[PDB]
Amino acid sequence: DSIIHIGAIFDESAKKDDEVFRTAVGDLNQNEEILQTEKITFSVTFVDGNNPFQAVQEACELMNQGILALVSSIGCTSAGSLQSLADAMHIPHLFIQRSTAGTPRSGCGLTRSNRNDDYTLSVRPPVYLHDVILRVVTEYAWQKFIIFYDSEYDIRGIQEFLDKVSQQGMDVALQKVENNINKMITTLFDTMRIEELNRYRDTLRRAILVMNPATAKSFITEVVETNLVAFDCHWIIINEEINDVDVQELVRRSIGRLTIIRQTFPVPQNISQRCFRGNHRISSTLCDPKDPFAQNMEISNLYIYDTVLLLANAFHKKLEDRKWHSMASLSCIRKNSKPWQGGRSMLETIKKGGVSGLTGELEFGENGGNPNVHFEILGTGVRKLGCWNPVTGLNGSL
Amino acid sequence: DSIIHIGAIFDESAKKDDEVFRTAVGDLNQNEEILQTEKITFSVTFVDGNNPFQAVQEACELMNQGILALVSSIGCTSAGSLQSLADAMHIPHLFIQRSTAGTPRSGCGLTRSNRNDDYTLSVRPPVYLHDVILRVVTEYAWQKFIIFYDSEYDIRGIQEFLDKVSQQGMDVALQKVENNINKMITTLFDTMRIEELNRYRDTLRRAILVMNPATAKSFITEVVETNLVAFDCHWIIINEEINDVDVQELVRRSIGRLTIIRQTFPVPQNISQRCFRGNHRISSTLCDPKDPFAQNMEISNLYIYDTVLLLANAFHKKLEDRKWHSMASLSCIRKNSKPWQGGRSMLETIKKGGVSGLTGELEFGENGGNPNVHFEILGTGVRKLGCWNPVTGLNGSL
Ligand SMILES: [Ca+2]
Ligand SMILES: [Ca+2]
Ligand SMILES: [Ca+2]
Ligand SMILES: [Ca+2]
DSSP states (O other): OOOOOEEEEETTTHHHHHHHHHHHHHHHOSSSSSTTTOOEEEEEEOOTTHHHHHHHHHHHHHHOOOOSSSEEEEEEHHHHHHHHHHHHHHHEEEEEEEEHOOOOOOOOOOOOOOSSSSOOOEEHHHHHOHHHHHHHHHHOOOEEEHHHHHHOOOGGHHHHHHHHHTTTTTTEEEOOOSSHHHHHHHHHHHHHHHHHHHHHHHHHHHEEEEEEHHHHHHHHHHHHHHHHTTOOOEEEEOOOOHHHHHHHHHHHHHOOOEEEEEEEEOOOOOOOHSSETTTTTHHHHHTTTTHHHHOOHHHHHHHHHHHHHHHOOOOHHHHTTOOOOOOOOOSSSSSTOOOTHHHHHHHHHHHHHHEETTTTTEEEOOOOOOOEEEEEEEEOOOEEEEEEETHHHHHEEO | OOOEEEEEETTTTTTHHHHHHHHHHHHHOOOSSSSOOOOOOEEEEOOTTOHHHHHHHHHHHHHHOSSEEEEEOOHHHHHHHHHHHHHHHHOOOOEOEEEEEOOOOOOOOOOOOOOOOEEEESOOOOOOOOHHHHHHHHOOOOOOEEEEOOOOOOOOHHHHHHHHHHHTTTTEEEOOOOOHHHHHHHHHHHHOHHHHHHHHHTTEEEEEEEEHHHHHHHHHHHHHHHHOTTTTTTEEOSOOOOOHHHHHHHHHOSEEEEEEEEEEOOOOOSSSSEEEETEEEEOHHHHHHSSSHHHHOOOOHHHHHHHHHHHHHHHHHHHHHHHOOOOOOOSSSSTTTOOOTTHHHHHHHHHTTTEEEEEEEEOOTTBOOOOOEEEEEOOOOOEEEEEEEEEEEEOOOO
């Protein structure tokens, strides 16, 4: 007989989030130290992330079943709708932002209504891309460069960076890179001429790529092959999510200098402590860095695992404190729709929770967002040049 | 006994849209030539435009009452949710995009799901700001300038413009203007010095303001007073919505050259034909340019009027063709929620409609959007320098 039931809404592209979600629940149900006498059960629904009404409808159906919390892994398009639904129903909403096609994340810029209590906790850290890239270009004493971004990137994400470089009098070009690079560059040679080409080549000597790894790979290869860059060029690629396979391929395809900036996770070193966090045992497929799955995990997958860990500890604490409120079957858009009476106290318990997991430490600040993040800085073989985090800033000279 | 009932959802800031909506219905119900034996009735609801679940909920309640079409005047935050609801319920959705606080419009960038038929018709024309401003800077042979934007503007709206000026090798600075200008500029003098000040003054010799009129007025006054600009400066202000009072105040507060770019509406000249479109008589408060109300109308107000005119003609045609489908009471998020069976044919009738109204001609292209728009270009007293539209382009040399 289950009294612990959670709901999950996933974008159709988030099959790996669903896999890790289910594995996390499995791991916790094997853990005798957390929720000693209660199993966690769940209901999952996949939706078209670009259909906010579908998102709301299917979230509402989960709330009718009865849930303690709603986990979502979805993009910005439906995020606002789910956040506002959660606010109306007092269902704690653990929101894991997914980027589109591996493009670098930008804030959802949601301007969600602040009249009502906010039932959404943002599991992924704030987007710090603009801060990190400013620090790195400053260290390299750049004065003139071009920013290339892919067709999915939201340039509001660099608006602060653009303001700052302008204030400092720099010569910064923007350019969207079409999903089809060959046409873009082929068109370029046909239309331009020697004096113009030399100018473009000069512009390409310093660039920043704000794009998904696949497009960057293709983009680098095409300019290298067409000799638009040479051994003196220096490109910076920045994206929270670039895996080791991507890094090696980027280095392999590029000539000259490459700097790679990606998110990193501060997890224990010892083999023993790798698949353990205290007495919680993690399935080897997620924590062993020799496992093929673990190496192929998306960043959102790591946050989903830790989210389930955090929820389980919150439910445990609520039971231990003898302040349990039973789940309720809710209804959306009905004459007597009413919020979950247990919601406010559950939200507060979750909000002050903290766990050690696959991402490092997951916790929430007063603004309802995870504050913890670390970036590593690689440089061309390839080696680790430094680290960045929003607290201590840049460590290790570049 | 009414068989013609429409619904409207308005942002809390859209009281004038509601007023003009009601006046339009009144005007049509007085018109014996359109809907000769049927009165139009309606239900209006105001919502927090930043609360997409509230928007959906209240739209759903209107659909439960029974409506032939849904008119909305709202910002991008809830637009996606209402569009996807309309798609699910097959309710024709006449969407009038409102900008926040008079900031220049940018596309909602909605990436709304295209698997399903699109029941939304976009009443306002596409955002052409980026096209117009490119043409004007080219005519002035600008090579170096700064773009100032207000705190609400979505810079994705100029991403194409930024790409183009980069391609042409221009030196273009960006800067957000905080809602509080004095602090921004006061901070500036305290921190900077003669060599830096001369450089900033030089940067301010050519600027584009992408902001609401109120902030522009304040911004111009503060730089003029602090002598950061002089008689040789040349600023361009661009916004669909700048009324005559705003224009005069802008000119009055500015020194040097000012170019103002705003939307204009090609309506008849003759006094008689001003408050008439064929045999349809328009209330004098909306069409007489000597009336105080008409002079204070927002752009969205004009589109709301024409939208009601267009819907009435569509209903008329549907009746005349003997293809009427009665409204139905629909339910959202229920076990047997079903779309309106009359929706597909009503959508198609509306989509191919066209009326002469307060905006000029309102009609829809194959993409479901109004294609018609005209910009006028004013220049400093003040006079009309030229016109722009996406068909014939720029007319009258600047
Ligand atoms: Ca369902
Ligand atoms: Ca910040
Ligand atoms: Ca209501
Ligand atoms: Ca275009």
